[PDB]
Amino acid sequence: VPNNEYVQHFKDMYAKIHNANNGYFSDEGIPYHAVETLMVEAPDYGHETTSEAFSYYMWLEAMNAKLTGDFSGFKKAWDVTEKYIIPGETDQPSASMSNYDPNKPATYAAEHPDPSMYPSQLQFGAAVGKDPLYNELKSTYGTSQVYGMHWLLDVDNWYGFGGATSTSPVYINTFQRGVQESCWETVPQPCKDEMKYGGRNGFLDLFTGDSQYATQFKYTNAPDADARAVQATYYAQLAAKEWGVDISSYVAKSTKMGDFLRYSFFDKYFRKVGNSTQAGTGYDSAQYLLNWYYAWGGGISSNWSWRIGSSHNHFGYQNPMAAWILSNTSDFKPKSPNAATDWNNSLKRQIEFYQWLQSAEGGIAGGASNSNGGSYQAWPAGTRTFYGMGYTPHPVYEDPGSNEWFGMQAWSMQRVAEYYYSSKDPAAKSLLDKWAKWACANVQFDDAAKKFKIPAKLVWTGQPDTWTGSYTGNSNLHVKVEAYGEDLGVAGSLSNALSYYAKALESSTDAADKVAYNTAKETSRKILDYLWASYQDDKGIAVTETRNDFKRFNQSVYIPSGWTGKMPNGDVIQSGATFLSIRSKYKQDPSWPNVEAALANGTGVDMTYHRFWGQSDIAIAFGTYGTLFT
């Protein structure tokens, strides 16, 4: 096993993350989104957590097993995942799941350009296609229940949906009201709406319009997280083979999760791809990318259920490494007969998607949708397309734009790089060559200070050429870096990507590849060296960030006229609500006085955060460099 300073940096970070003093984990052994509680950005409280965090926990532990031969931590990560974030029997009652109708997967409702247009009316007469996965999955696993992670967990019952005296985890959701509903504009709701909290119909009639409402459950996948779980488990299995350890039952968990993850291939209402006013008859509604979500729900008081995909796709979610694992390794072939073939088709489609979205400069553009406006509107003449899906610079969300964050670049291209290293697929080479040149040109080193900045915010203009099968250079698609910053988690991910890219180039004898190898490897190493030299603190590796967006604690929340309800703690929900007015426990937070002062004299809020995923990306980047370059 490698024994160098980068391996040691991993072990030191690993020890920090697991030290009880540092507060990364709950009583249940669940990693929080961040150590710090006052935190709003996708989760809206720091001690919520995400399926993303669980997948990073798996990945962190896989790297530890690789370096130490100890797999106990990895097994633990999967055990807590299955117990707490994959809905169980009381969460998705089998009698409802078994009453699914794959010929009528769900009832159509439009998405809308503003939260004020919700609830959206259920349209029982509108077309919905056939679900071609259900019967195969049911036959394979002997149940109709779904084995996938729900995306958001209230780890210590901060919202109180679990009752006034519990700190056990509660499945919750936030985002419901379309493209303009930012994290500041949601109304948090329990995934199991038993109408005990909220209004007359619980929270249900904020979101969907119907003539009556019954108690029900709803879960929503984050496909990028479930794919990362597969990626992590493959790394653990490589380690298991090296160390002579059997983790086959954990491999089986990941492959089952990857089997259900095929729902992320499908249009929201199983509409034909590129002919989206029409109901699909099966795989003609397969987009074959990792979409923004699949979701499923059903009755509590009576037995019924539904499933949806998503028509929207973001490059930042894709994971060719996961797709390759599930389609081209024997260990991770899923049990459903068609799963490996489906994943092989997704692998090819994903790599095409990255190429299609690659800007003139090299950054990857947003994505594509099968549902213009989220209501299957006609595409404007001249719309640029990918297998019939229209280009979208900012998939799903525009407050802020979902492709403004540079982190998607690092996260997603890390997977392409690891995939290229593993498969040496020539279709990934020019894509990575071009992306890496752009990324490295935008890392700003201060060598005297041993510090750096990387892009924070990206601005997009133009559009790609319609995909005809090969990259065009996309001369009219552009990215500009609008701001630079010190997001250390993203920097860790970027190092990881550059490490795999360089290692993949190591066998090249081409002179230009050798130059690129040196540049990528040195850039990766310097990021790691400067992280270690200059950014360590007691809990991990971190730096202050200014959150000007925290002015939105007083953000108005849309509530329909005449609608009234209450949060579990009694906060009144009615027109005139704000982010803070329905989350009054924020004023009990130890960081609140600082926030309230800041709002008082019009400043951004300075915070130093230890995000679990960020600390994990940094640790894993150390371990990656230390293992690839011995």
Ligand SMILES: OC[C@H]1O[C@@H](O[C@H]2[C@H](O)[C@@H](O)[C@@H](O)O[C@@H]2CO)[C@H](O)[C@@H](O)[C@@H]1O
């Ligand atoms: O939604 C994507 C991820 O966002 C992460 O938060 C980002 C945020 O989007 C940026 O605007 C900026 O503030 O940096 C944050 C930290 O990198 C969030 O932590 C992740 O959980 C999301 O997947």
Ligand SMILES: OC[C@H]1O[C@@H](O[C@H]2[C@H](O)[C@@H](O)[C@H](O)O[C@@H]2CO)[C@H](O)[C@@H](O)[C@@H]1O
């Ligand atoms: O209410 C019964 C009716 O619900 C439909 O499911 C809705 C669900 O009510 C709503 O809360 C959720 O957000 O969307 C789904 C979309 O289907 C279901 O499709 C019907 O079969 C069911 O009878």
Ligand SMILES: OC[C@H]1O[C@@H](O[C@H]2[C@H](O)[C@@H](O)[C@H](O)O[C@@H]2CO)[C@H](O)[C@@H](O)[C@@H]1O
């Ligand atoms: O708005 C579409 C869809 O969003 C779902 O939440 C997403 C969230 O937008 C994303 O930031 C996070 O990483 O993943 C979750 C789960 O996919 C929301 O749960 C859906 O109800 C909503 O329709």
Ligand SMILES: [Ca+2]
């Ligand atoms: Ca708890």
Ligand SMILES: [Ca+2]
């Ligand atoms: Ca908004």
